[PDB]
C-alpha cells in the first residue's frame, strides 16, 4: 500500500489520529 508522498498524506491522516505514531505515516506498516 504505502509510498511516501502518500504517507506524508497519512502523516496528514496522521492527524487522522487515533494514533500519535499509532501508526501515521512514518509510523506506517503498509507495502
Curated annotation (Swiss-Prot):
Zn(2+) 2 binds at residues 2, 7, 25, 28. It is found in: Nucleus; Cytoplasm, Cytosol. Coiled coil: none annotated. A motif (CysB motif) lies at residues 2-28. In eukaryotes there are five DNA polymerases: alpha, beta, gamma, delta, and epsilon which are responsible for different reactions of DNA synthesis. Catalytic subunit of the DNA polymerase alpha complex (also known as the alpha DNA polymerase-primase complex) which plays an essential role in the initiation of DNA synthesis. During the S phase of the cell cycle, the DNA polymerase alpha complex (composed of a catalytic subunit POLA1, a regulatory subunit POLA2 and two primase subunits PRIM1 and PRIM2) is recruited to DNA at the replicative forks via direct interactions with MCM10 and WDHD1. The primase subunit of the polymerase alpha complex initiates DNA synthesis by oligomerising short RNA primers on both leading and lagging strands. This is DNA polymerase alpha catalytic subunit. It comes from Homo sapiens. The lineage of its organism: Eukaryota, Metazoa, Chordata, Craniata, Vertebrata. The chain holds residues 1347 to 1377 of 1462 of the full protein.
Amino acid at each position: 500500500i504505502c509510498e511516501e508522498p502518500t504517507c506524508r498524506n497519512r502523516t496528514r491522516h496522521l492527524p487522522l489520529q487515533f494514533s500519535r505514531t499509532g501508526p501515521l505515516c512514518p509510523a506506517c506498516m503498509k507495502a
